[PDB]
Design an enzyme around this catalytic site. Sequence first.
Site, PDB file in Angstrom:
ATOM      1  CG  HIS B 101      66.424  81.877  -9.620  1.00 35.23           C
ATOM      2  ND1 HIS B 101      67.695  82.329  -8.789  1.00 35.23           N
ATOM      3  CD2 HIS B 101      65.657  82.014  -8.383  1.00 35.23           C
ATOM      4  CE1 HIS B 101      67.400  82.079  -7.603  1.00 35.23           C
ATOM      5  NE2 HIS B 101      66.151  81.840  -7.572  1.00 35.23           N
ATOM      6  CB  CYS B 133      58.790  94.228 -28.702  1.00 36.00           C
ATOM      7  SG  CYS B 133      57.212  93.442 -29.355  1.00 36.00           S
ATOM      8  CB  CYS B 136      54.471  96.863 -29.872  1.00 39.27           C
ATOM      9  SG  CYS B 136      55.421  96.560 -28.493  1.00 39.27           S
ATOM     10  N   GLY B 174      79.149  76.033  -5.378  1.00 42.04           N
ATOM     11  CA  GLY B 174      78.955  77.541  -5.627  1.00 42.04           C
ATOM     12  C   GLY B 174      77.864  78.320  -5.517  1.00 42.04           C
TER      13      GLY B 174
HETATM   14 ZN   LIG Z   1      55.706  94.104 -28.160  1.00 46.08          ZN
END
Ligand SMILES: [Zn+2]
Lengths: 10, 236
Positions: B101, B133, B136, B174
């Site tokens: 995963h 981020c 951005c 587990g």
């Molecule tokens: Zn970004």
Amino acid sequence: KGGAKRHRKW
Amino acid sequence: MEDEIRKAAEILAKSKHAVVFTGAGISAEPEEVASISGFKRNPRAFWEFSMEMKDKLFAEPNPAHYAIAELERMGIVKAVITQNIDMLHQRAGSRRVLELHGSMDKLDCLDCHETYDWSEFVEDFNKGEIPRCRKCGSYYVKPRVVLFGEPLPQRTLFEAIEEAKHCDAFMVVGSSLVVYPAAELPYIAKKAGAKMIIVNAEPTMADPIFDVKIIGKAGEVLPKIVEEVKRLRSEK
Ligand SMILES: [Zn+2]
């Protein structure tokens, strides 16, 4: 490809 | 549980190719929180959930992780297949770890595709500031973890299937074996003729397929198995 990560009872 | 511990040790000591399969039971001590549809709707919920969960997980490897690392060092365990994303196996010294995963180690902004290391976010994260981020400003910083509803990394899954198909001992530690496709792997090993061992705090619906069943804490049980294996090999 194994499908999606998912919950099953067994 | 001593006769079961000894039975598990005998299996491991005689094996040509032992595999260990682990889930959250070794690390600890739903749609909105841990699925791709949930993340796309509200990525902040995923991160707030992760902040709560971090407190419930082991901050560093426990004796079960070290025992599994030692079995690899001894040349017995050839691979660790894990459902966990916390990298505790690697931090305990395990090398051949298949992360079904993924893990928190690397992350991507879904909007501008900027890439990150977890080391860049961990300080803020521990203060409750969610990953954002920097390029951005997006709220959609997704770790390279397989969330519910996503397919697994193909190379890793192939390797894990190959391990299951060609092992002669397969030890689950587990995991309740309710998350697919991960949960298919013990059945593959069983079909391939592997001796099947399970170590869990509680029963699972998959218990009937196992040759050895141990109910207990992995941190207590796994070291005892290792000590018995060493005795069988005249190393103790
Ligand atoms: Zn970004």
